[PDB]
Write a protein that binds this ligand. Structure first.
Ligand SMILES: [Mg+2]
Ligand SMILES: [Zn+2]
Ligand SMILES: [Zn+2]
Ligand SMILES: [Zn+2]
Lengths: 103, 93, 55, 100
RNA sequence: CGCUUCUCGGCCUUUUGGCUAAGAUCAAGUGUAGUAUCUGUUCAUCAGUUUAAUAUCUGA
RNA sequence: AAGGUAUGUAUCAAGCUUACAAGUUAUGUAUUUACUGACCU
Protein backbone atom coordinates (compact mmCIF):
# COMPACT_ATOMS: atom_id res chain seq x y z
CA UNK A 1 0.00 0.00 0.00
CA UNK A 2 2.79 2.40 0.91
CA UNK A 3 1.06 4.87 3.20
CA UNK A 4 4.21 6.41 4.78
CA UNK A 5 3.09 8.08 7.97
CA UNK A 6 5.25 10.42 10.01
CA UNK A 7 6.71 7.96 12.51
CA UNK A 8 8.46 6.16 9.67
CA UNK A 9 9.40 9.32 7.76
CA UNK A 10 11.37 10.62 10.72
CA UNK A 11 13.02 7.25 11.28
CA UNK A 12 13.96 7.25 7.60
CA UNK A 13 15.50 10.70 8.02
CA UNK A 14 17.52 9.36 10.95
CA UNK A 15 18.56 6.27 9.00
CA UNK A 16 19.76 8.18 5.94
CA UNK A 17 21.61 10.47 8.35
CA UNK A 18 23.37 7.42 9.78
CA UNK A 19 23.93 4.91 7.00
CA UNK A 20 24.19 6.69 3.69
CA UNK A 21 22.91 6.96 0.16
CA UNK A 22 23.44 3.71 -1.78
CA UNK A 23 22.68 1.50 1.16
CA UNK A 24 18.99 0.82 1.46
CA UNK A 25 18.57 -2.78 2.53
CA UNK A 26 20.41 -1.91 5.73
CA UNK A 27 17.87 0.83 6.47
CA UNK A 28 14.88 -1.13 5.30
CA UNK A 29 16.05 -3.57 7.98
CA UNK A 30 14.39 -1.45 10.67
CA UNK A 31 10.98 -0.41 9.35
CA UNK A 32 8.80 -3.58 9.73
CA UNK A 33 6.69 -2.91 6.63
CA UNK A 34 8.93 -1.35 4.03
CA UNK A 35 11.38 -2.79 1.53
CA UNK A 36 14.44 -1.00 0.24
CA UNK A 37 12.66 -0.09 -3.01
CA UNK A 38 10.05 1.88 -1.09
CA UNK A 39 12.76 3.54 0.99
CA UNK A 40 14.54 4.77 -2.14
CA UNK A 41 11.20 5.83 -3.57
CA UNK A 42 10.26 8.03 -0.66
CA UNK A 43 13.65 9.48 0.20
CA UNK A 44 14.08 10.66 -3.36
CA UNK A 45 10.38 11.42 -3.87
CA UNK A 46 9.47 13.26 -0.67
CA UNK A 47 12.18 13.43 2.03
CA UNK A 48 15.20 14.62 0.08
CA UNK A 49 16.63 17.78 1.67
CA UNK A 50 17.21 19.29 -1.77
CA UNK A 51 13.49 19.11 -2.57
CA UNK A 52 12.05 22.63 -2.61
CA UNK A 53 8.65 21.23 -1.73
CA UNK A 54 6.81 24.61 -1.61
CA UNK A 55 7.22 28.10 -3.14
CA UNK A 56 5.85 27.97 -6.67
CA UNK A 57 7.76 30.66 -8.50
CA UNK A 58 6.83 32.62 -11.61
CA UNK A 59 9.94 31.86 -13.65
CA UNK A 60 9.54 28.09 -13.39
CA UNK A 61 5.87 28.22 -14.35
CA UNK A 62 6.46 30.20 -17.52
CA UNK A 63 9.28 27.75 -18.04
CA UNK A 64 7.23 24.57 -17.72
CA UNK A 65 4.12 25.67 -19.60
CA UNK A 66 6.25 25.79 -22.72
CA UNK A 67 8.49 23.01 -21.55
CA UNK A 68 5.59 20.58 -21.16
CA UNK A 69 4.57 21.62 -24.66
CA UNK A 70 7.91 20.59 -26.13
CA UNK A 71 7.63 17.04 -24.83
CA UNK A 72 3.99 16.71 -23.90
CA UNK A 73 3.96 13.77 -21.49
CA UNK A 74 7.25 12.85 -19.84
CA UNK A 75 7.29 14.55 -16.48
CA UNK A 76 10.45 12.67 -15.55
CA UNK A 77 12.43 14.12 -18.42
CA UNK A 78 11.36 17.70 -17.67
CA UNK A 79 11.51 17.27 -13.92
CA UNK A 80 15.31 17.86 -13.65
CA UNK A 81 15.06 20.71 -16.16
CA UNK A 82 12.48 22.54 -14.08
CA UNK A 83 14.28 21.44 -10.96
CA UNK A 84 11.05 21.38 -8.99
CA UNK A 85 12.08 17.82 -9.74
CA UNK A 86 9.67 15.79 -7.64
CA UNK A 87 8.13 14.85 -11.05
CA UNK A 88 4.61 15.09 -9.60
CA UNK A 89 5.02 18.54 -8.11
CA UNK A 90 5.41 19.34 -11.80
CA UNK A 91 2.22 17.46 -12.53
CA UNK A 92 0.51 19.30 -9.68
CA UNK A 93 1.64 22.61 -11.22
CA UNK A 94 0.50 21.62 -14.68
CA UNK A 95 -2.95 20.41 -13.71
CA UNK A 96 -3.50 23.35 -11.33
CA UNK A 97 -2.48 25.82 -14.01
CA UNK A 98 -4.71 24.17 -16.55
CA UNK A 99 -7.55 24.45 -14.09
CA UNK A 100 -6.76 28.13 -13.54
CA UNK A 101 -6.47 28.67 -17.30
CA UNK A 102 -9.93 27.11 -17.67
CA UNK A 103 -12.13 27.89 -14.59
CA UNK B 1 27.74 -31.06 -6.68
CA UNK B 2 29.40 -27.73 -7.11
CA UNK B 3 31.16 -27.66 -3.81
CA UNK B 4 32.57 -24.33 -4.92
CA UNK B 5 29.48 -22.64 -6.31
CA UNK B 6 26.79 -23.72 -3.91
CA UNK B 7 25.30 -21.04 -1.62
CA UNK B 8 27.49 -21.44 1.38
CA UNK B 9 26.78 -21.74 5.05
CA UNK B 10 28.85 -22.50 8.12
CA UNK B 11 28.59 -25.43 10.48
CA UNK B 12 27.11 -24.97 13.94
CA UNK B 13 25.15 -21.99 12.69
CA UNK B 14 21.98 -22.12 14.76
CA UNK B 15 20.05 -20.53 11.91
CA UNK B 16 18.07 -17.37 11.32
CA UNK B 17 15.78 -16.40 14.17
CA UNK B 18 12.01 -16.25 14.22
CA UNK B 19 9.88 -13.15 13.90
CA UNK B 20 9.68 -12.37 17.63
CA UNK B 21 13.41 -12.29 18.29
CA UNK B 22 14.04 -10.50 14.99
CA UNK B 23 11.66 -7.64 15.62
CA UNK B 24 12.69 -7.41 19.27
CA UNK B 25 16.20 -6.88 17.94
CA UNK B 26 14.70 -4.35 15.53
CA UNK B 27 13.20 -2.42 18.45
CA UNK B 28 16.48 -2.47 20.39
CA UNK B 29 18.35 -1.43 17.25
CA UNK B 30 15.92 1.40 16.62
CA UNK B 31 16.28 2.49 20.24
CA UNK B 32 20.06 2.74 19.77
CA UNK B 33 19.47 4.64 16.53
CA UNK B 34 17.21 7.24 18.10
CA UNK B 35 19.44 7.58 21.15
CA UNK B 36 22.46 8.35 19.01
CA UNK B 37 20.50 10.77 16.81
CA UNK B 38 19.30 12.77 19.80
CA UNK B 39 22.83 12.56 21.17
CA UNK B 40 24.08 14.13 17.93
CA UNK B 41 21.27 16.68 18.10
CA UNK B 42 22.33 17.18 21.77
CA UNK B 43 18.69 17.40 22.84
CA UNK B 44 18.44 18.20 26.57
CA UNK B 45 14.73 17.39 26.96
CA UNK B 46 14.61 13.75 25.88
CA UNK B 47 14.06 11.56 28.92
CA UNK B 48 13.59 7.82 29.09
CA UNK B 49 11.58 6.75 32.11
CA UNK B 50 11.50 3.72 34.40
CA UNK B 51 9.75 1.51 31.83
CA UNK B 52 11.23 2.22 28.40
CA UNK B 53 9.15 5.07 27.05
CA UNK B 54 10.11 8.54 25.99
CA UNK B 55 9.22 11.95 27.38
CA UNK B 56 9.51 15.50 26.18
CA UNK B 57 10.55 16.98 29.51
CA UNK B 58 9.68 20.61 28.87
CA UNK B 59 6.60 19.34 27.05
CA UNK B 60 5.83 16.76 29.79
CA UNK B 61 4.51 14.46 27.07
CA UNK B 62 4.77 10.67 26.85
CA UNK B 63 5.77 8.68 23.78
CA UNK B 64 5.56 4.95 23.16
CA UNK B 65 8.38 4.50 20.66
CA UNK B 66 11.20 6.41 19.03
CA UNK B 67 9.41 7.98 16.10
CA UNK B 68 6.71 9.18 18.46
CA UNK B 69 9.33 11.30 20.16
CA UNK B 70 11.31 12.51 17.20
CA UNK B 71 8.17 13.46 15.37
CA UNK B 72 7.29 15.51 18.44
CA UNK B 73 9.75 18.22 17.56
CA UNK B 74 7.42 20.39 15.48
CA UNK B 75 4.02 20.95 17.11
CA UNK B 76 3.12 22.86 20.31
CA UNK B 77 6.01 25.34 20.36
CA UNK B 78 6.96 25.50 23.96
CA UNK B 79 10.30 25.06 22.20
CA UNK B 80 10.09 28.82 21.57
CA UNK B 81 7.77 29.62 24.48
CA UNK B 82 10.93 29.34 26.50
CA UNK B 83 11.47 32.89 25.21
CA UNK B 84 9.31 33.86 28.21
CA UNK B 85 11.59 31.84 30.47
CA UNK B 86 14.54 33.45 28.69
CA UNK B 87 13.02 36.86 29.44
CA UNK B 88 12.85 35.78 33.06
CA UNK B 89 16.43 34.54 32.57
CA UNK B 90 17.44 37.97 31.25
CA UNK B 91 15.21 41.05 31.20
CA UNK B 92 16.52 42.11 27.75
CA UNK B 93 17.30 40.52 24.38
CA UNK C 1 5.84 -42.93 -6.72
CA UNK C 2 6.22 -39.73 -4.74
CA UNK C 3 3.16 -37.51 -4.58
CA UNK C 4 3.77 -35.75 -1.28
CA UNK C 5 3.98 -32.00 -1.30
CA UNK C 6 6.83 -30.95 -3.53
CA UNK C 7 4.61 -27.99 -4.38
CA UNK C 8 4.06 -27.41 -0.63
CA UNK C 9 1.81 -24.40 -1.08
CA UNK C 10 2.96 -22.15 1.74
CA UNK C 11 5.28 -24.72 3.15
CA UNK C 12 4.98 -23.83 6.77
CA UNK C 13 6.36 -20.46 6.00
CA UNK C 14 9.68 -20.73 7.76
CA UNK C 15 12.85 -18.68 7.78
CA UNK C 16 15.32 -20.57 5.51
CA UNK C 17 18.86 -19.28 6.21
CA UNK C 18 20.78 -19.42 2.95
CA UNK C 19 21.80 -22.92 1.97
CA UNK C 20 18.37 -24.26 2.80
CA UNK C 21 16.91 -21.63 0.51
CA UNK C 22 18.95 -21.91 -2.68
CA UNK C 23 20.84 -25.19 -2.34
CA UNK C 24 19.96 -28.38 -4.15
CA UNK C 25 17.55 -30.86 -2.61
CA UNK C 26 19.64 -33.96 -1.96
CA UNK C 27 16.83 -36.35 -1.14
CA UNK C 28 15.30 -37.18 -4.58
CA UNK C 29 18.86 -37.26 -5.87
CA UNK C 30 19.71 -39.98 -3.39
CA UNK C 31 16.46 -41.93 -3.58
CA UNK C 32 17.08 -42.33 -7.30
CA UNK C 33 20.54 -43.60 -6.44
CA UNK C 34 19.09 -45.98 -3.86
CA UNK C 35 16.58 -47.20 -6.39
CA UNK C 36 19.07 -48.49 -8.97
CA UNK C 37 21.51 -49.74 -6.33
CA UNK C 38 21.91 -53.22 -7.87
CA UNK C 39 23.13 -51.86 -11.20
CA UNK C 40 25.04 -48.85 -9.91
CA UNK C 41 26.62 -51.09 -7.36
CA UNK C 42 27.19 -54.30 -9.29
CA UNK C 43 29.97 -56.49 -8.04
CA UNK C 44 31.78 -57.34 -11.26
CA UNK C 45 32.71 -54.35 -13.44
CA UNK C 46 36.06 -53.77 -11.92
CA UNK C 47 36.53 -56.61 -9.50
CA UNK C 48 39.33 -55.14 -7.44
CA UNK C 49 38.73 -52.99 -4.40
CA UNK C 50 35.48 -52.97 -2.46
CA UNK C 51 34.78 -51.33 0.89
CA UNK C 52 32.20 -52.64 3.29
CA UNK C 53 30.37 -50.23 5.53
CA UNK C 54 30.74 -50.64 9.25
CA UNK C 55 28.01 -52.48 11.17
CA UNK D 1 -17.16 -15.46 31.03
CA UNK D 2 -14.86 -12.75 32.29
CA UNK D 3 -13.18 -12.31 28.92
CA UNK D 4 -16.26 -11.59 26.83
CA UNK D 5 -18.09 -8.95 28.90
CA UNK D 6 -21.35 -9.15 26.98
CA UNK D 7 -22.10 -12.79 27.83
CA UNK D 8 -24.99 -13.07 30.26
CA UNK D 9 -25.63 -15.92 32.70
CA UNK D 10 -28.94 -17.72 33.17
CA UNK D 11 -29.10 -17.17 36.95
CA UNK D 12 -32.27 -19.12 37.69
CA UNK D 13 -32.64 -21.64 40.52
CA UNK D 14 -30.10 -24.43 40.42
CA UNK D 15 -31.72 -27.84 40.22
CA UNK D 16 -30.19 -31.30 40.51
CA UNK D 17 -28.79 -31.53 36.98
CA UNK D 18 -24.98 -31.60 37.04
CA UNK D 19 -23.25 -29.24 34.62
CA UNK D 20 -21.00 -30.46 31.83
CA UNK D 21 -18.09 -28.93 29.92
CA UNK D 22 -17.02 -29.56 26.35
CA UNK D 23 -13.75 -31.16 25.31
CA UNK D 24 -12.36 -27.76 24.31
CA UNK D 25 -13.06 -26.28 27.75
CA UNK D 26 -12.25 -29.08 30.17
CA UNK D 27 -10.73 -27.80 33.38
CA UNK D 28 -12.06 -24.26 33.00
CA UNK D 29 -13.87 -22.83 35.95
CA UNK D 30 -17.18 -21.30 35.06
CA UNK D 31 -17.06 -17.94 36.85
CA UNK D 32 -13.41 -17.07 37.56
CA UNK D 33 -12.55 -19.12 34.46
CA UNK D 34 -9.28 -20.77 35.43
CA UNK D 35 -7.83 -24.23 35.67
CA UNK D 36 -6.67 -24.90 39.20
CA UNK D 37 -8.34 -26.00 42.41
CA UNK D 38 -11.79 -27.29 41.38
CA UNK D 39 -13.91 -27.69 44.46
CA UNK D 40 -17.65 -27.65 43.78
CA UNK D 41 -19.89 -29.25 41.13
CA UNK D 42 -22.18 -27.20 38.93
CA UNK D 43 -25.95 -27.55 39.26
CA UNK D 44 -27.94 -26.15 36.37
CA UNK D 45 -31.62 -25.31 36.14
CA UNK D 46 -34.19 -27.47 34.45
CA UNK D 47 -34.89 -25.07 31.60
CA UNK D 48 -31.21 -25.01 30.69
CA UNK D 49 -31.20 -28.80 30.87
CA UNK D 50 -34.19 -29.97 28.86
CA UNK D 51 -34.29 -32.55 26.11
CA UNK D 52 -31.91 -31.52 23.35
CA UNK D 53 -29.81 -29.54 25.86
CA UNK D 54 -28.76 -32.46 28.06
CA UNK D 55 -25.08 -33.13 28.66
CA UNK D 56 -24.27 -30.00 26.67
CA UNK D 57 -21.38 -27.68 27.53
CA UNK D 58 -22.07 -24.91 29.99
CA UNK D 59 -19.97 -22.33 28.17
CA UNK D 60 -19.57 -23.42 24.56
CA UNK D 61 -22.82 -25.30 24.09
CA UNK D 62 -20.78 -28.05 22.51
CA UNK D 63 -21.16 -31.69 23.47
CA UNK D 64 -20.06 -32.14 27.05
CA UNK D 65 -17.43 -34.61 28.20
CA UNK D 66 -16.53 -33.99 31.84
CA UNK D 67 -18.30 -32.48 34.82
CA UNK D 68 -18.10 -28.78 35.49
CA UNK D 69 -16.68 -27.18 38.60
CA UNK D 70 -16.15 -23.92 40.42
CA UNK D 71 -12.75 -22.85 41.76
CA UNK D 72 -11.94 -22.72 45.40
CA UNK D 73 -11.86 -18.97 44.86
CA UNK D 74 -15.36 -19.05 43.49
CA UNK D 75 -16.45 -21.39 46.26
CA UNK D 76 -15.21 -19.39 49.23
CA UNK D 77 -16.61 -16.22 47.71
CA UNK D 78 -19.90 -18.17 47.41
CA UNK D 79 -20.21 -17.46 43.73
CA UNK D 80 -21.70 -20.92 43.46
CA UNK D 81 -24.69 -20.08 45.62
CA UNK D 82 -26.19 -17.70 43.08
CA UNK D 83 -28.13 -18.96 40.05
CA UNK D 84 -27.22 -21.57 37.47
CA UNK D 85 -24.15 -20.52 35.53
CA UNK D 86 -25.37 -21.56 32.08
CA UNK D 87 -24.20 -18.93 29.61
CA UNK D 88 -27.27 -18.19 27.54
CA UNK D 89 -26.54 -15.82 24.69
CA UNK D 90 -23.96 -16.24 21.95
CA UNK D 91 -22.85 -12.73 21.15
CA UNK D 92 -20.23 -11.02 18.96
CA UNK D 93 -17.72 -13.89 19.08
CA UNK D 94 -17.95 -17.26 17.30
CA UNK D 95 -20.64 -15.57 15.17
CA UNK D 96 -18.69 -13.08 13.07
CA UNK D 97 -15.87 -15.62 13.05
CA UNK D 98 -18.40 -18.01 11.54
CA UNK D 99 -19.16 -15.31 8.98
CA UNK D 100 -15.40 -15.07 8.52
C1' C E 1 57.00 45.68 24.39
C1' G E 2 56.07 43.69 19.21
C1' C E 3 57.11 40.06 14.95
C1' U E 4 58.47 35.05 12.35
C1' U E 5 60.15 29.80 13.01
C1' C E 6 60.86 25.46 16.29
C1' U E 7 59.57 21.83 20.34
C1' C E 8 56.37 19.95 24.69
C1' G E 9 51.10 19.79 26.47
C1' G E 10 45.55 21.31 27.16
C1' C E 11 42.51 18.67 21.91
C1' C E 12 37.11 18.87 18.04
C1' U E 13 36.28 12.42 11.63
C1' U E 14 39.83 8.24 13.10
C1' U E 15 34.68 1.65 11.97
C1' U E 16 37.70 -3.97 12.02
C1' G E 17 41.90 -1.84 7.17
C1' G E 18 42.23 -3.91 0.68
C1' C E 19 39.63 -6.01 -3.81
C1' U E 20 35.48 -8.64 -6.60
C1' A E 21 29.43 -9.58 -9.64
C1' A E 22 26.53 -2.42 -4.68
C1' G E 23 30.74 -9.76 -3.32
C1' A E 24 25.89 -12.40 -3.08
C1' U E 25 21.19 -13.01 -1.60
C1' C E 26 16.63 -12.11 2.20
C1' A E 27 12.62 -9.46 5.08
C1' A E 28 4.25 -12.73 4.85
C1' G E 29 -0.73 -11.79 9.29
C1' U E 30 -5.54 -12.64 11.01
C1' G E 31 -10.37 -11.76 13.55
C1' U E 32 -12.90 -9.82 18.55
C1' A E 33 -13.89 -6.74 22.93
C1' G E 34 -11.68 -2.75 25.27
C1' U E 35 -8.07 1.20 26.98
C1' A E 36 -3.69 4.47 27.09
C1' U E 37 -0.75 8.04 24.15
C1' C E 38 1.31 11.24 20.30
C1' U E 39 0.38 14.07 15.79
C1' G E 40 -3.33 16.99 13.30
C1' U E 41 -7.11 20.50 15.63
C1' U E 42 -9.81 24.50 17.39
C1' C E 43 -11.69 27.10 21.47
C1' A E 44 -21.05 39.03 24.87
C1' U E 45 -24.80 39.90 30.03
C1' C E 46 -28.96 37.67 31.60
C1' A E 47 -32.78 33.81 32.57
C1' G E 48 -33.85 28.67 33.27
C1' U E 49 -31.23 23.39 31.26
C1' U E 50 -27.33 20.67 33.53
C1' U E 51 -23.20 19.67 36.84
C1' A E 52 -20.18 18.17 43.22
C1' A E 53 -18.93 22.95 41.43
C1' U E 54 -17.79 24.16 36.23
C1' A E 55 -18.75 24.19 30.83
C1' U E 56 -25.00 23.66 25.29
C1' C E 57 -29.53 25.93 24.58
C1' U E 58 -32.54 30.49 24.75
C1' G E 59 -32.50 36.09 26.04
C1' A E 60 -30.77 42.19 24.53
C1' A F 1 42.27 -35.73 -3.62
C1' A F 2 40.64 -30.92 -1.62
C1' G F 3 36.13 -28.34 -1.46
C1' G F 4 31.83 -29.69 5.72
C1' U F 5 30.85 -31.39 9.82
C1' A F 6 34.95 -25.74 12.79
C1' U F 7 39.97 -23.52 15.84
C1' G F 8 41.80 -21.49 19.94
C1' U F 9 43.51 -21.92 24.74
C1' A F 10 45.04 -24.11 30.07
C1' U F 11 47.03 -29.24 32.55
C1' C F 12 48.61 -34.97 31.72
C1' A F 13 52.31 -39.77 28.91
C1' A F 14 54.93 -42.08 24.24
C1' G F 15 56.61 -40.65 19.86
C1' C F 16 60.98 -38.58 18.44
C1' U F 17 66.14 -36.35 20.22
C1' U F 18 71.71 -36.37 22.40
C1' A F 19 73.49 -40.52 24.84
C1' C F 20 77.17 -35.78 25.12
C1' A F 21 80.56 -30.98 28.00
C1' A F 22 81.78 -32.06 33.66
C1' G F 23 86.79 -31.93 40.35
C1' U F 24 -0.52 26.23 31.34
C1' U F 25 -4.14 22.28 33.02
C1' A F 26 -8.66 21.19 28.70
C1' U F 27 -12.08 19.90 24.61
C1' G F 28 -13.99 18.04 20.15
C1' U F 29 -11.99 15.07 16.49
C1' A F 30 -8.98 13.28 11.84
C1' U F 31 -5.15 9.96 13.49
C1' U F 32 -1.17 6.59 14.13
C1' U F 33 1.71 4.00 17.80
C1' A F 34 1.64 1.11 22.16
C1' C F 35 -1.27 -1.87 25.77
C1' U F 36 -5.11 -5.12 28.04
C1' G F 37 -8.65 -9.80 28.56
C1' A F 38 -4.69 -17.77 29.43
C1' C F 39 -10.51 -13.52 24.00
C1' C F 40 -10.78 -16.60 19.37
C1' U F 41 -10.85 -21.87 14.48
MG1 LIG G 1 32.16 -21.93 3.69
ZN1 LIG H 1 -13.33 -19.66 39.50
ZN1 LIG I 1 -30.32 -22.08 33.29
ZN1 LIG J 1 -16.75 -25.02 26.41
Amino acid sequence: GGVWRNTEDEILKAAVMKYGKNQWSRIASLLHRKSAKQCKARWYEWLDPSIKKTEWSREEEEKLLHLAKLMPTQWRTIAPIIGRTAAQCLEHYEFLLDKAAQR
Amino acid sequence: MDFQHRPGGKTGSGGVASSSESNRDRRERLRQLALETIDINKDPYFMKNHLGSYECKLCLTLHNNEGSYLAHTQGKKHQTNLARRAAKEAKEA
Amino acid sequence: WEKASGFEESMKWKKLTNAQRSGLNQIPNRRFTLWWSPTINRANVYVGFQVQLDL
Amino acid sequence: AKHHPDLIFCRKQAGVAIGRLCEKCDGKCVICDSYVRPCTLVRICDECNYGSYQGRCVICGGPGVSDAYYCKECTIQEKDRDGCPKIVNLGSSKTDLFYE
